[PDB]
Amino acid sequence: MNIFEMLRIDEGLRLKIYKDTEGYYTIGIGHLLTKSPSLNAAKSELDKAIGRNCNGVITKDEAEKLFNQDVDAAVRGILRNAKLKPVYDSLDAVRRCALINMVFQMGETGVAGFTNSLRMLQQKRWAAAAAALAKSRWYNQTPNRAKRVITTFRTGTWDAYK
Ligand SMILES: [Cl-]
Ligand SMILES: [Cl-]
C-alpha cells in the first residue's frame, strides 16, 4: 500500500466536474477546482489546468497527471512548513502517509492548525493524538475517511485500508 493507492481510495476517480463534499467544484482524484459557485469559473479553471478546452470533462491520464502534481505539492508544502516539517521528520513511514493524506485534503494551513494533535504526534502519544483529531469539524464532515486517517496515525499500520 502506498500514498497514491491510499488517496485513490479516499477520494475516488471522477472524470467530469463535480461538487465535492462542500459545494466545491472538483474533478479527478480530489483536485479542487474552485470555491466559487460558478460552474463557469470551475469550467474555466479546468481549462487552464489541463491546458485545453476540456468542456468540464477530463481523461484518466489527465486526472493522473493532476494527482501526481497534487501529491508532490503536498509533500513539498509539508517540507517547507515550519510547523509541519518537524512533525513529519519525527514520524515512521506509515504515519507520514497519514500526514500527507490530511495536507492533500485540507491544505497546509488547515493541518497546521491541529496544534495540539501535532504536538501529541511529535511526542508519540498516539492514543491521545487520535482523540484530539476526532474533535474537529473534519471528523464530523467526513467521518469515515477521517477515521481511516486517524486509525492510521494511531496504529502505524495500513489496516484501515486493507
Ligand atoms: Cl488539535
Ligand atoms: Cl467537535
Ligand SMILES: [Cl-]
Ligand atoms: Cl467520508
